[PDB]
Structure 1
Amino acid sequence: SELLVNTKSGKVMGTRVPVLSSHISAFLGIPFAEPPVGNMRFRRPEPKKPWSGVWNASTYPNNCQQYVDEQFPGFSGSEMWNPNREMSEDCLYLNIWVPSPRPKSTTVMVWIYGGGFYSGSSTLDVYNGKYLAYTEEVVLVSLSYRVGAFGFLALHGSQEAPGNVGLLDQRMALQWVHDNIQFFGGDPKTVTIFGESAGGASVGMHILSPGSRDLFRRAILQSGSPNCPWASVSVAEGRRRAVELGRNLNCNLNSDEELIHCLREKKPQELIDVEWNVLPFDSIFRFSFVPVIDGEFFPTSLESMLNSGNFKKTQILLGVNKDEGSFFLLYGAPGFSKDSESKISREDFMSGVKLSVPHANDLGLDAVTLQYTDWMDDNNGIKNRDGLDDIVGDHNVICPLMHFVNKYTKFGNGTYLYFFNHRASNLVWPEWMGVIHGYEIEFVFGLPLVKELNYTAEEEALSRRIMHYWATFAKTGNPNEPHSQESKWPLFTTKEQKFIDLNTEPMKVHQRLRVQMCVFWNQFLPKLLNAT
């Protein structure tokens, strides 16, 4: 049977799913690791023991335990990111969409979801891989990994809670794909890992980590890079937050063994209830439990690795959205609301700056403020609003990615950069939020092709073009169709630094993306904070 596949871990039975008037095979909920439950909580994942019989892979698996957004109950804009399956620590599974008839050895794409390392699910409707798998004829895989304290509590030195285990979950899934995707018609030597936000950061981390490099061919990073200020902490900061977490649950803190033991007896929701109380500063765009520079997964600092070319050298395709920072301002900055234009006063602008660069002294705050203020019109609510939006997106997403791309390109084998600036016509979020963090995803997964979701014809065309770019890149290392009559997405070079816009208008090539602001964030500000 086309729905029956014999893997090295055992037999699996998929289900035939309908897609754009056709069908394909879907193997949902395939286990790739032993449930990280009980004394296994916080531990490195263990490969799933092979099973006898046939594993029923007809339905989605549980989503990992995570904080649930209730800011706008029932609002689709936010609900679409929340777990749509029951939560459970028994959540290490992967899903596979396979073209029908089953391919023999085709391009494979593995999706890593974002969610600030504290949330995320591989089962979201917006991550449905059937459209992409079907349209581009690729074997699409979406993995899962532990988030929150469960995936990133770090107590360096102990083997019970070493940290980075969520990244190891990802790696194990990639190991499984490398070992078994061939049986699903996938070519293990042509696997592209791709993800957005924390998932984009993750992809970058697998590019850096020696232990992950050999498990994939190329990579795509969307609105995220390994060097993002929110993507990692030092072993010292990690330990401090772990201890503070224990302190929030009245844990004995005399030893790691003591702390770990206590944390393991707590119910999932007990950890989630206090998870945000460990942040060192009053901030936005900062998450409690994230990857840690432990000297193992990452041998040295990320910057020294990037400088010395200590990373996998292959081709990469990455980019950012126009208004990466709007969502976090909405959720955590005074003066921003979902149902108003959110014109910001000068006072709220200053408050916003303080929240956005939590690690800065007064001189630093003054530098940022000066950089983003039009002094000929400083009390303009729109300009103040948009200014804060840029500060957040530039500092947390765009500039970190630009630093990564420039460092990578020096040693890499091909870079393709994009700037997504199309505001979807059916967008439910307010206009002031613009082109939102994460809203390029629906185009990458081809949702616009579904009439019921009512996008415009132009948007359907954009999605098809984006899907073909992603899949062609995954297949060849070049998003451009060889001998095509279409406009060519140019390579990004250390010299020209070219990139393209991704929207419903005729492709346009630009250079030095957000260079003026990124020189400030990547060169000047750090030097300033270092000296002062």
Structure 2
Amino acid sequence: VSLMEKLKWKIKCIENKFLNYRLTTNETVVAETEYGKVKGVKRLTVYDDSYYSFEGIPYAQPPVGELRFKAPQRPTPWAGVRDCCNHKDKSVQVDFITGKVCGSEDCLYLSVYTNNLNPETKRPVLVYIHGGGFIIGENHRDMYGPDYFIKKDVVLINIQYRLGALGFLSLNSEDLNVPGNAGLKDQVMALRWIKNNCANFGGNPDNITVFGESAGAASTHYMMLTEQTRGLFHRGILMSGNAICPWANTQCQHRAFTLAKLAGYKGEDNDKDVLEFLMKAKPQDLIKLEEKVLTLEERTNKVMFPFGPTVEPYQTADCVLPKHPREMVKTAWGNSIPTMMGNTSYEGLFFTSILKQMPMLVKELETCVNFVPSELADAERTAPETLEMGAKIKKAHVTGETPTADNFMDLCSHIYFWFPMHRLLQLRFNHTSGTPVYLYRFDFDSEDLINPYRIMRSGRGVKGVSHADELTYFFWNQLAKRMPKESREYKTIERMTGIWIQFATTGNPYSNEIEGMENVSWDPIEKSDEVYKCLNISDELKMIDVPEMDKIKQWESMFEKHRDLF
């Protein structure tokens, strides 16, 4: 990204540190945990609110040395008081702005926030899992500030977990104990920590809500799908993603050799020898080369990331994905806790920057064969079927006659978000307690208040509600500002945090006490529903038929002759 945003980022980083100092108080405090006592500190917000802040709480031992690529291990307990008045480093990743690798293998921490350490009642516990394609992201408050949430009486917790190769390497060989999904297992162990530790911070361990956006939504869903976590939490919110989005899973067992060879491995394709090499490599080296691992073929079949959540090739004590996520839904304990799901009104706008550098992508819409679900597509995407299935995609998204960039981004909304949501709901309904799932559609557009994701997708001046635009209304970030309390932006912040806290508290997102919601009557989806209804969140809160419904059904019709695969 341009030098100009790099210099502006540097300064906004320069501001964020002085401001972070300015909003601490000299009030320090100490909480008990099962692994030892922790020293927090009270902080302020631009809205003159205050909250206790505990950052850098380890829930696992540092996945370094021999622990790299392995499932996480219980951290080592301490006497005395561990300092938690500051945040730890982020997972090793490529900074999208600097271009350079940053972060650390020592990254397995969570941050706990609450306005009152001694509440009159035990509070609902909200656990956020950040997105970023399982390759970027942080729990640092410069991107995920708890400032909006702590206005209300809850305990908010943001976790970190290993990213990219270091989190999701997977080897076919049972001897080596790298089945995969380390990053997910970080999450499992962190949730296990929260269930055993939130009460110490004033949180009701019997009322825990896990939520995340994008890869954090996928992650939340995985945490709802895996037997490792049954009964850990009690509500789930999937923001713009779930476990069966095609970008949320990959069979990457063969990609460990390619990474090694990119890193200069000399030798043969042997799981043991590849691992021995990857074990000694510099972390920054593997992570930076990660961008080169996918073949031209993979990219063409829309494989988004080389390493990510995977179906583990052999079971272990800590295994998390023994079968395909579509399969794991069958017996998913999470099918039977209140669920809320949603997408933004223009998800695909997220790919603007990628289109800019590769406008030839738009030419893929002339037949759309490359977007047919891979499980239905033939290898060459030349079969007449594949062309007929593609025509269905084309009919649904190509509006003129030479396909456009907007058509392309409109298509992306469905292949990556709306259609996997549909498949999930339909799949889940056959295997459920009858527990309610609620839909929202985030449709609020503004540039008065943004977040860094807008810079990454080149969305400056750009209208429409992109993937991740709603994060602005949930978390403080270093590009934000104090808004007038009568502004539409400030109003959305109250609404979004309101409904999220309402749903967390009660398993039902509706409350008459949330402004703009008096005439709302928000029903969940029922198995018998022909048409999904959703709370559309704009300047007005309005229950509507999901506008994307006709296109969703159009995608579903590709499965006409292959209903078992739907």
Instruction: Provide TM-score, normalisation by structure 2.
Output: 0.81
1:24 aligns with 2:51: yes
Q: Structure 2: state its 5+ residue gaps.
A: 1-26
* Residue of structure 1 aligned with 2:548, choices 507, 514, 519: 514
Partner of 1:471: 501
Q: Structure 1: state its 5+ residue gaps.
A: 74-78, 337-343
What one-letter code is carried by the residue in structure 1 that aligns with 2:278? L
Partner of 2:276: 261
Q: How does 1:28-427 map to 2 (within 5 A)?
A: 28-70=55-97, 87-100=103-116, 102-103=118-119, 104-132=121-149, 134-156=150-172, 157-233=174-250, 237-251=251-265, 252-280=267-295, 281-283=298-300, 286-294=304-312, 296-307=319-330, 311-332=334-355, 347=363, 349-350=365-366, 353=368, 359=374, 360=377, 361-362=381-382, 363=384, 364=386, 367-368=389-390, 371-372=393-394, 377-379=400-402, 384-410=404-430, 411=432, 412-426=434-448, 427=450
- Structure 1 residue 495: deviation in Å? 2.4
CA–CA distance in structure 2, aligned partners of residues 125 and 387 of structure 1: 34
Which digits, 9 at most, give the CA deviation of each residue in 1:10-55, with x for residues without a partner? 0101011012213110001111110000111000100111112111
Q: Is the 8 A contact 1:2 1:102 kept in 2?
A: no
What one-letter code is carried by the residue in structure 2 that aligns with 1:371? I
Partner of 1:341: none
2:216 match: secondary structure: helix
Q: Is the 8 A contact 1:492 1:498 kept in 2?
A: yes
2:63 match: secondary structure: coil
CA–CA distance in structure 2, aligned partners of residues 92 and 386 of structure 1: 39
CA–CA distance in structure 1, aligned partners of residues 363 and 323 of structure 2: 41
* Residue of structure 2 aligned with 1:6, choices 11, 17, 32: 32
26 and 9 in structure 1: CA distance in 2 versus 1, 3 angstrom threshold: same
What one-letter code is carried by the residue in structure 2 that aligns with 1:162? P
CA–CA distance in structure 2, aligned partners of residues 298 and 445 of structure 1: 30
Which stretch has the larger CA shift, 415-424 or 251-260? 251-260
What one-letter code is carried by the residue in structure 2 that aligns with 1:417? L
- Structure 1 residue 500: deviation in Å? 1.5
What one-letter code is carried by the residue in structure 1 that aligns with 2:259? L
CA–CA distance in structure 1, aligned partners of residues 415 and 270 of structure 2: 37
* Residue of structure 2 aligned with 1:498, choices 517, 533, 544: 533
Which stretch has the larger CA shift, 324-333 or 177-186? 324-333
Q: Is the 8 A contact 1:105 1:182 kept in 2?
A: yes
CA–CA distance in structure 2, aligned partners of residues 47 and 164 of structure 1: 17
376 and 33 in structure 1: CA distance in 2 versus 1, 3 angstrom threshold: closer
CA–CA distance in structure 1, aligned partners of residues 494 and 171 of structure 2: 45
- Structure 1 residue 393: deviation in Å? 1.4
1:418 match: secondary structure: strand
Q: Is the 8 A contact 1:190 1:475 kept in 2?
A: yes
Partner of 1:76: none
Q: Is the 8 A contact 1:424 1:455 kept in 2?
A: no
308 and 94 in structure 1: CA distance in 2 versus 1, 3 angstrom threshold: closer
Work out the percentage of aligned pairs sharing the same amino acid: 29
CA–CA distance in structure 2, aligned partners of residues 467 and 333 of structure 1: 34
Which stretch has the larger CA shift, 250-259 or 392-401? 250-259
- Structure 1 residue 419: deviation in Å? 0.9
Q: Is the 8 A contact 1:43 1:159 kept in 2?
A: no
CA–CA distance in structure 1, aligned partners of residues 215 and 406 of structure 2: 24
- Structure 1 residue 521: deviation in Å? 3.1
- Structure 1 residue 159: deviation in Å? 4.2
Q: Is the 8 A contact 1:459 1:504 kept in 2?
A: no
Q: Is the 8 A contact 2:521 2:543 kept in 1?
A: no
CA–CA distance in structure 2, aligned partners of residues 89 and 439 of structure 1: 29
1:504 match: secondary structure: coil
Q: Is the 8 A contact 1:33 1:45 kept in 2?
A: yes
305 and 21 in structure 1: CA distance in 2 versus 1, 3 angstrom threshold: same
What one-letter code is carried by the residue in structure 2 that aligns with 1:9? Y
What one-letter code is carried by the residue in structure 2 that aligns with 1:279? L
CA–CA distance in structure 1, aligned partners of residues 208 and 264 of structure 2: 45
370 and 473 in structure 1: CA distance in 2 versus 1, 3 angstrom threshold: closer
What one-letter code is carried by the residue in structure 1 that aligns with 2:400? D
Partner of 2:522: 489
- Structure 1 residue 467: deviation in Å? 0.8
What one-letter code is carried by the residue in structure 2 that aligns with 1:29? G
- Structure 1 residue 277: deviation in Å? 2.3
Q: How many residue pairs end up in the alignment? A: 504
Which stretch has the larger CA shift, 370-379 or 391-400? 370-379
What one-letter code is carried by the residue in structure 2 that aligns with 1:519? K
CA–CA distance in structure 2, aligned partners of residues 308 and 33 of structure 1: 28
